[PDB]
Amino acid sequence: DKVTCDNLEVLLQYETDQKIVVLKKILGTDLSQYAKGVQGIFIDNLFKKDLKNLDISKKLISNGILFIWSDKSLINEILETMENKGFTYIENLVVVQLSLEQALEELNKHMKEQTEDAVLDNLDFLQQKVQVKDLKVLNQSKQVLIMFRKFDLELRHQRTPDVLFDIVNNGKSCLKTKEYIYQTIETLLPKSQLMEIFAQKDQPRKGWISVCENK
């Protein structure tokens, strides 16, 4: 018996993309040279690219926080991978995934957000456990953003809560991380130097360093 509020911030209320655009073949390369120190980092790990063979200890200042991504399965092995790399786990945010197909399902409708407008009427018919249908003895319907700390623009600590609700990719060939997570980063950290590794051409962010290989 809750709706709408959950979906507001998650979707439909930074557009432009552009403080470096590092390009490379990361398997060949090393990251030490590139500008630092950075007091925060963000790896889009939905792809599950091996990160163990990543050098992040040098770049980060003694004090830093790390944001990592696993869409479903690899909850525990990220933790060792970071521990090996020097970071202690601090918090979790769960992107809870509501299927679009389930939302537009009733009363009968097709397109798209159309469903977003209708949360007013929609809210009445179904409960958050009912639109949680999703595409391991569970159908995991989440992605988890993982947070670590490396040492001993709104500051406040209780600024963004762990959970968010989104409606799943309309197009299967989508590999993006919601722009809202950046706000969580930028609100949580007022420090100027932040970093995103494995960035797209689309995802470069102002006052961020994006390091990406081709394709």
Binding site: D1, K2, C5, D6, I65, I75, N76, L79, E83, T88, Y89, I90, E91, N92, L93, V94, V96, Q127, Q128, K129, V132, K136, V137, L138, N139, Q140, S141, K142, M147, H157, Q158, R159, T160, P161, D162, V163, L188
Partner: protein, 178 residues
């Protein structure tokens, strides 16, 4: 519960059922709140208590990695996580006592050991996420045991560290202040 003997539990259970516990849930007191040193909870023969079953262990965000070590230490392999998001009278509101984040959620790990292929352990009809609002302090939502029931419909269950807040059918609990 260093003082407690699980030997009394094993002798009665095996003779009585001939089967070790199918499922085990715990809310360990973390060092007040039961004043327990991390090791002591970490060193009880939970391996002894159940032979072919899952386990459920609620881990605080602060103490999340630790328990992963813990269940994995007991001969389990991590499989699934159930996350409960607190629903206030309306909406998703939750406590703000999170240093970097407000923690509006709790996570319950699932660990698997033994052969679970056989007929009783039915599969793939479960909620990874529970929406129920925080109950009278301090308690877990009712959907869990209803969820566990689907998993092991007619089996022995064991809860550990249970104040007899929710004494349940077919559930056996050993607790301090019960």
């Amino acid at each position: 519960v260093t003082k407690l003997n699980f030997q009394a539990l094993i002798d009665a259970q095996m003779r009585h059922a001939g089967k070790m516990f199918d499922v085990i849930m715990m809310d360990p007191p973390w060092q007040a709140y039961d004043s327990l040193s991390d090791e002591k909870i970490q060193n009880m023969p939970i391996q002894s208590l159940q032979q072919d079953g899952f386990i459920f262990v609620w881990a605080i965000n602060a103490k999340y990695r630790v328990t992963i070590k813990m269940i994995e230490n007991w001969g389990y392999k991590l499989v699934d996580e159930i996350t409960w998001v607190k629903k206030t009278v309306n909406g998703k509101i939750a406590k703000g006592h999170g240093f970097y984040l407000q923690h509006a959620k709790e996570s319950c790990l699932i660990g698997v050991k033994g052969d679970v292929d056989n007929g009783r352990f039915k599969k793939n009809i479960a909620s990874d996420v529970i929406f129920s609002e925080r109950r009278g302090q301090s308690q877990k939502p009712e959907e869990i045991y209803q969820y566990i029931n689907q998993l092991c419909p007619n089996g022995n269950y064991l809860e550990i560290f249970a104040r007899r807040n929710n004494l349940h059918d077919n559930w056996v609990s050993i607790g301090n202040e019960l």
